[PDB]
Every structure is written in structure tokens, then in C-alpha cells.
Amino acid sequence: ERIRDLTSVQGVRENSLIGYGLVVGLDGTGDQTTQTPFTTQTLNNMLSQLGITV
Amino acid sequence: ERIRDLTSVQGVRENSLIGYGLVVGLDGTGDQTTQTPFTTQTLNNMLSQLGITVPTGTNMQLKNVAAVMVTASYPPFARQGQTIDVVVSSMGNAKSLRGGTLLMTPLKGVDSQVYALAQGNILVGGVNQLNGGRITNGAIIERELPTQFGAGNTINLQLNDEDFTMAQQITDAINRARGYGSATALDARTVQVRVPSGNSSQVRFLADIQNMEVNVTPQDAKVVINSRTGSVVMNREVTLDSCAVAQGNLSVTGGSLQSVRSSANLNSVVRALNALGATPMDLMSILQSMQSAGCLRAKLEII
Amino acid sequence: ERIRDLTSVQGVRENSLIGYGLVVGLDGTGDQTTQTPFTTQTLNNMLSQLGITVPTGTNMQLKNVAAVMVTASYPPFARQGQTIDVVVSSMGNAKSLRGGTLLMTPLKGVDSQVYALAQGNILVGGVNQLNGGRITNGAIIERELPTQFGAGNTINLQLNDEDFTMAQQITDAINRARGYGSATALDARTVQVRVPSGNSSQVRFLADIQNMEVNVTPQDAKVVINSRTGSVVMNREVTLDSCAVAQGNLSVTGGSLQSVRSSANLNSVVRALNALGATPMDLMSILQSMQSAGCLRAKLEII
């Protein structure tokens, strides 16, 4: 059980994924949204997608 | 009962549903509705749908209503009429959702189609989170997803963790239990299983396969370090090589350089590292330095 | 009496009804009606319907009236004249609904049709929620839903939790009790049962099936973590693998690295984790780190 600990197999590799999201349900410890316009912009985007146009 | 704990069946998967709703019945701990216009806008929308038209120019300052986002999981083979649990999370400047009620909320999928309808009473712990809650059986399934299960003679078991040895072990176990060419391995993560054509026969085959017992072969040595929570976890395959370690305010129980012996099993590694007298935050730096030097014969993963 | 606790009958489902109403008889704990124009607007609507026309330009400042939202459940096979319980939740800036009375409220469905009428006296606990209440038998059913029950020779039992083993067990139990081809499995969640044509015969068949006893096979190992309420729940299938754990302010009862033994049953797992001397909030991080490393042979679900 040492070769698996010393080498890696060609083609058997890991990639990296990134994305943007919103986290809700905080107890008043979220963004101020006055210094972060993108939070409100993306919340409005989500609401518009769901059918609400602010 | 190990195969069901090591793999997942192809096509038997869970989806994610999201939706918007209003939570009423709060004890003055709802939205301020002056900094959250969408709460009042959607309340007016609901009232208009119910037959009440509030004039556009009017000041509405509510205290018992909070705009919330509802999240749910669409289960495999979900059927209309079935109930699922939902999570309700406040969206803006609300104080608590302790005794609230979630009104009719359509839960959309990624394709923006309604798959469930959510309505129920929130349970909030009450150090405890106040702006988040859970409703058991809070949403009723309304749409069903087509699937290919029961069609064809091939089904893929997908391992939770990639391993050629574990894939071969599962394949050999299935071949030992249910005939010569019952299962084959495609890669380190997928095992292809031949099943009879039909629905009931495949359910029987999967029922026999799922509870099968497979002896887990030893995995790769791995040390998991969580600096955000301050934890270190070492599996049973971690070994150590002999080398000297020095760190601030740590000394022989004497000199600042302490010898670490060659260790073969996990008990020896734990004894050698406890001989250092290191705090876990110090142990993180020690382990990283030893991985850089080469004493630590394990994969150091920071999570 | 286990099949009725493990499955649901296709077509036998519950719907959700919503409506708007006014609650009167409060002891000065109602809406302010200056920040909630809809309360006064709907009170004027009710008075106009009853024959009283209050002039449009007039200041109405009420204290015993609260605008509320009423939620109810439409039961399976509901018939007009039957009574159901309703939940009454305040909507804006009301203080309490302790001794209120709900006036005539039409409960609409998703299709915006009246299915029930709600009117009664609210019961409020009175640490207790003041803006939410329940009325037992508060709504009378007014509309009935057509259904296909009694038509055809097939009925589907839908499992609460998807499992090929449990589906096969239910199918085998039905076949063992009521003939060879009485039940078949379609997927991990649905079991198709053949029943005689008619209404009474299918009711008899379902009555015999529902109270049948089925031995539940072991499920998947699962550790449920609720960070919002601070709870951890481990089922009987959770096992542990030997590995070392370190966390802040936790030490051998000595060194900061503590060994965790290989555990087969739940009692061994509980003993090993209690040997760590970890607070449940610390146990959450420990369990997540062990799942990342691989000691925890269970599915870690955060709810």
C-alpha cells in the first residue's frame, strides 16, 4: 500500500470549480449592501428570475 | 449492507428546488419593509390575487411579515402527492421567524418549473439561529421527472471515492455472488452491472446488490487540517519518519530540538506527536513543515 | 400496521388552502390601521356588503381588528359539510390575537377557487406566540375534488423513503399474503398493486394491505447535523475507523492528539466519541473533519 502513496496515475486528476452565490438566513450578520452593490444587484436578478420585479 | 454505503445507483439522484415566499405570524420580529420593498410588493401581489387592491400610493409598515427564501430537495423517483422537508431562510433585516407560518410557495427547479408547493409552520430552535428554520413535510410534490430506469440491461454503480482497488473489490464481490459476468469495472469510480430487462427484475437485482458486504481495502494516508475550526484528523494509514522538530516555546521535557521517531502505525504516530507537547494550532505548522521536509508520509489536505 | 406507516396511496393526498380574513374582539392589541391600509379597506368592504357605506374621506383608527391570513389543509376525499382545522396568522404590526374571532373567510386553492369557509374562535397559548393561533374545526368544506380511485385495476404504493430493498420487501410481503402476482415493483419508491375493479373491493384490498407488518431492512448510515439548533443524531448503522483527532482545548484525559478506535456498532462509536470529551458544537467540526479524512463511514447531512 505504498505505490498508491508515492505516485499518481496519469489522467486520474482533480480539477477546480468556482462560482458565485448568495447566503441567506443570517442573524443580522450579512452584507451591509451599501458598500457591496453586487449583493443587491444579484438579489434583484434572482427575484426577477423568480417573477418579482423590484 | 456496505455496497449501499459505498456507491450510488446511476439515475437515482436528488435535485435542488428553490422558491420565494412570505412568513406571517411573527411577534413584531419581521421585515421593516422600508428597507425591503419586495416584501410589501409581494404582499400587495398576494392581496391582489385574493381580490384586494391596495392603492399604489400608500405607506405600508408591517411588523409580522418576513420575505423568505425556501429551499428543498427533490428526491429520486418522486411522485405527486408526496411530502418533503423544506428550509426557510430570511432574506433582509428580519429579526426572527420563531412562530411564523409559510404561505403558499412554488418551488422551482433549475429549468424554472414548479415541482412542489410549500406551506406549513416553521420550527426554530430558540446561541440558536433565529432567521432560519425547517418544516418537515412542508412541501407537496406536484411534478414528476421521467427516467430511464428499467430500460436497457446495464446499470452503473458510482463509487463515492475513486479507487481502483475498491472498484475491483466491488466487481469481484458481485461476480462471486451473482455469476461470472455480472459486473465489470469501467474506471476507478464506476462499475457496470448487467441486469435483466424490465422494472421488477432490476429492482430485485439492486435489492440483492445493495445490502452486499464488501471488505474495504486500505485507502491513501491523509491528514486533514481545518484551520478555520482548529482541528486535525489523521487516518490509520499515516506513518512518520525520524527527524528533528523545533518550534517556538516548545522544548524537550531541555533543548528546543526534539527528536521524532520512525513510526509505522497510527498509535506510534500519535505517541510521537504527543511527546512534542504541541497545541493543535502548533501541530498544524509542525505537520506542514514535516510534510515539506518529508517526515510525514501522508497527503496533507487543508479543508 | 407498518405498511401504512411506510407508504402512501396514490391519489390519496392532501392539498393546501389559503385565504384572507379579519379577526375582531381583541383587547386593544389589533392593527394600528395607519400603517396597514388593507385592514380598514377590507373592513369597509365588509360593511358595504352588509349595507353600511362609510364615506370615503374619513379617518378610521381601530384597535380591536387585525388583518390575518388563514391556512388550512384539504384532506383526501373531502366532502362538503365536513370541518377542518385552520391556522390564523397576523400580517402587519398587530400585537396579539389572544381572544379574537375569525370572521367569514373563503379558503382558496391553487386554482383560486373557494374550497372551504372559515369562521370561529382562535385559541392562543399565552415565551408563547401571540400573533399565531389555531381553530379546530374552524372551516367547513364547500367543494369536492374528483378522483380516479375505484377506476382501473392498478394502485401505486409510494414509499416515504426511496429504497430498493424496502420496495422489494413490501412487494414480497404483499405477494406472500395475497397471491402470486398481487404486487410488483416499478422503482426504488413505487410498488404497483393489482386490485379488483370497483370501489368497495379496492377499499377492502387497501384495508388488508395497510395494516400488514413488514420488517424494516437496515438503511444507509447517516449522521444528521443541525448547526442552527446545535444537535447531532447518528443512526444505528454508523461505524468508525481508527484515526487521531486534535482540536482546540481538547486533550487526552495529556497530549492534544487523541486516538479513536475502530468501531463496528453504535455503542462503540458513542463510547469512542465520548472518550474525546467534546462539546456537541466541537463534535460537529470533529465529525466533518473525520468525514473529510475518511474515518466516519456514514453520510454526513447538514440540515
Partner: protein
């Protein structure tokens, strides 16, 4: 009699909360505002004047 005719294609997400959309968000906007009666005929060139406007050297 006056006629105001409108045609076009509207994106659903451009519609406001009051079921309104400005005319500048409509893709193939066709807008027409015409009338009839002697008021409208008084705003038409005479046939001879149109002939001259199209065929006169200057």
C-alpha cells in the same frame, strides 16, 4: 376618428410590477398614429402639388 396601433415583441422580465413596460424595450416595435375625416384630408398634398414635388426640375 383617430387610430393608435402598436405591435411588437416583449421580454417578460422587462415588465414592471404594475404590468407595464416602456415602448423602448419592445424589439420589433411598430407604432402608428393616424386619423380620418376632413381634418386628415386637409393634411394631404394636392395631387398636382405632389406631382410637381416629385417631378419638377427644382
Amino acid at each position: 376618428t383617430e387610430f393608435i396601433r402598436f405591435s411588437g415583441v416583449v421580454n417578460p422580465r422587462t415588465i414592471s410590477g404594475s404590468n407595464s413596460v416602456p415602448s423602448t424595450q419592445v424589439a420589433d416595435a411598430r407604432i402608428e398614429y393616424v386619423g380620418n375625416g376632413y381634418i386628415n384630408e386637409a393634411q394631404n398634398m394636392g395631387w398636382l402639388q405632389r406631382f410637381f414635388l416629385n417631378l419638377s426640375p427644382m
